[PDB]
Design an enzyme around this catalytic site. Structure first.
Site, mmCIF file in Angstrom:
data_model
loop_
_atom_site.group_PDB
_atom_site.id
_atom_site.type_symbol
_atom_site.label_atom_id
_atom_site.label_comp_id
_atom_site.label_asym_id
_atom_site.label_seq_id
_atom_site.Cartn_x
_atom_site.Cartn_y
_atom_site.Cartn_z
ATOM 1 N N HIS A 212 11.067 9.064 14.739
ATOM 2 C CA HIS A 212 10.882 10.154 13.794
ATOM 3 C C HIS A 212 9.461 10.683 13.879
ATOM 4 O O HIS A 212 8.517 9.949 14.181
ATOM 5 C CB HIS A 212 11.226 9.752 12.347
ATOM 6 C CG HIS A 212 10.286 8.770 11.716
ATOM 7 N ND1 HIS A 212 9.054 9.132 11.211
ATOM 8 C CD2 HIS A 212 10.429 7.451 11.448
ATOM 9 C CE1 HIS A 212 8.465 8.069 10.688
ATOM 10 N NE2 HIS A 212 9.280 7.038 10.814
ATOM 11 N N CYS A 213 9.340 11.989 13.654
ATOM 12 C CA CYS A 213 8.055 12.620 13.413
ATOM 13 C C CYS A 213 7.979 12.894 11.917
ATOM 14 O O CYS A 213 8.068 11.962 11.113
ATOM 15 C CB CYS A 213 7.891 13.897 14.249
ATOM 16 S SG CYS A 213 9.375 14.929 14.432
#
EC number: 3.1.3.48
Length: 278
Positions: A212-213
């Site tokens: 995830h960012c």
């Protein structure tokens, strides 16, 4: 095969898919919030229901060719316990966090510092320990941690973490080195479970890298695309295939920016991998 004509046709196909996948007001294709608790970090970046991991997370199982991963948003404060449950039940062989240190420290963004420090989330306690630091090139650094997730009466699970402390455009070179580090980290952890005779190794829904960012559609999609091109089982899988599989399995925004699509194009071109399906 990689000229302006091929690129315009690829963007034509991908934009059409984004239009089609655009969420309606109460779209049955997408996960909805169960109760007065915000689910989506961004209202226009939603979670495909058929591939959702948990009912209270913006998170999706994604398979691109043969490559099996989970893509998610950076968890909201209220989602932390459920996020750690996803991590532990998945027997996560690597968690790749692509939000930068300065972005996490930006309190206006509301991203909790959940892997760089220990904490307690409901009945779950998490211990964070820093391990190696791996240079990715161009001054980009990955800080690595081990997250030890404990819950009384439950099996203790430790999760390797790869944190890219700065994203600037990230070159294809840095992205390539990041996919290798993430894949290698996952391989080492997965082999440990295999040496224990873990049943999770045969489970299609488990042992997936979690990436995830902030929203889980930009840098996250760029990395997942690079990992699938690092997978030797994905010969002849086109860029059109890759992005369309990411979009149908999470949302139409996967690969959000032109700069991210151009990285995937360059990586494919370096491999002789087709952009389009014939």
């Amino acid at each position: 095969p990689y000229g302006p004509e091929a690129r315009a046709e690829l963007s034509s196909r991908l934009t059409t898919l984004r239009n089609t996948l655009a969420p309606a007001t109460n779209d049955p294709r997408y996960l909805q919030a169960c109760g007065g608790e915000k689910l989506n970090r961004f209202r226009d970046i939603q979670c495909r229901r058929q591939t959702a991991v948990r009912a209270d997370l913006n998170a999706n199982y994604i398979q691109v060719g043969n490559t099996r991963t989970i893509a998610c948003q950076y968890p909201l404060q209220s989602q932390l316990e459920s996020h750690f449950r996803m991590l532990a039940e998945n027997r996560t062989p690597v968690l790749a966090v692509l939000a930068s240190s300065s972005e996490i420290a930006n309190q206006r963004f509301g991203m909790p510092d959940y892997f760089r420090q220990s904490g307690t989330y409901g009945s779950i306690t998490v211990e964070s320990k820093m391990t190696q630091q791996v240079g990715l090139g161009d001054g980009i650094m990955a800080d690595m941690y081990t997250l030890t997730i404990r819950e009384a009466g439950q099996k203790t699970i430790s999760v390797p973490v790869v944190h890219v402390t700065t994203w600037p455009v990230v070159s294809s070179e840095v992205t390539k080195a990041l996919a290798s580090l993430v894949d290698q980290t996952a391989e080492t952890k997965r082999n440990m479970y295999e040496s224990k005779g873990s049943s999770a190794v045969a489970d299609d829904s488990k042992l997936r890298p979690v990436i995830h960012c902030r929203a889980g559609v930009g840098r996250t999609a760029q990395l997942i695309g690079a990992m699938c091109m690092n997978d030797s089982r994905n010969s002849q899988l086109s860029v059109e295939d890759m992005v369309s599989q990411m979009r149908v399995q999470r949302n139409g925004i996967m690969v959000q920016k032109d700069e991210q699509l151009d990285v995937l194009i360059k990586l494919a071109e370096g491999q002789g991998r087709p952009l389009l399906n014939s």
